[PDB]
Ligand binder design. Sequence first.
Ligand code: 5EG
Length: 314
Amino acid sequence: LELRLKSPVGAEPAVYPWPLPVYDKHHDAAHEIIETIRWVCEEIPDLKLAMENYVLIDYDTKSFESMQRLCDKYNRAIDSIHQLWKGNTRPSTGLLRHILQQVYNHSVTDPEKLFSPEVYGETSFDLVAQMIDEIKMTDDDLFVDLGSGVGQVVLQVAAATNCKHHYGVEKADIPAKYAETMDREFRKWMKWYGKKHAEYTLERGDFLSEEWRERIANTSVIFVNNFAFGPEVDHQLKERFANMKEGGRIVSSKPFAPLNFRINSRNLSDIGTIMRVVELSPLKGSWTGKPVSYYLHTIDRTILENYFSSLKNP
Ligand SMILES: O=C(Cn1nnnc1COc1ccccc1Cl)NNC(=O)Nc1ccc(Cl)cc1
């Protein structure tokens, strides 16, 4: 006893066992099935016409026969459209949130072990989407998320941008191990829907290691949730940022330098002498979520050059 969903692009079908799994108090595989069908009907208007009107209205999630009739009415509609077609784009924001939730639900089987990953789609997703729209990224950029956890920020950026590569680095054992499954599941679900993503790597490691010193120096876009970082972690990170190229950017949860930094003879060693800092917020740019702010730092050594020029030409 199981339920099968045919891929809109001919990939291997989605197979769910019966009884259907329960993910948490606010997610179960039954609603995942219904929402997957609905998203595929939105991205394929012909499928909407083939699909009978009543099917996605009159349903019982606690009835095998009911859930099978629903799955079959979608599969028969996929088959009809696939026949009509006889005679890979980026996902929409809406579809991506659903894909990430799907990937998470299938990857983190014991959620007890872990703004937590559970609520990523309900809080963090929209802020990250807002960050992707603000920090414009090209095919020349290299993206790194320092302390990537289960890897959802990396998967979101990689599905939205055209960076050469996207990296996620996590030191902790439990999230780094879950990231391995998230990676496999993300690639599997993206192929299922027939969606394109940029290249990405989720790896285990310490971003303060010698290996990561040259790697940070060659990154053009760093995303770092530094809210909980200690003084030594913060001080070492600033040391790594100081080797970055002009125009290199760091997007963080707490600024690394004062927003009002004014260079003088007593603060010449501060990171503020080689970077610009701006507070950005979805409330500044029609937002209705949390009143949050993120901080954009841009490597600019002219701050330091101008100070010296002013001393020589007063
Ligand atoms: O584990 C992860 C992402 N993650 N994956 N699954 N769940 C989560 C929890 O997310 C969050 C937790 C707290 C705050 C925000 C998020 Cl998004 N690390 N990466 C990461 O926080 N990036 C990041 C976030 C904000 C800025 Cl300003 C700069 C970088």
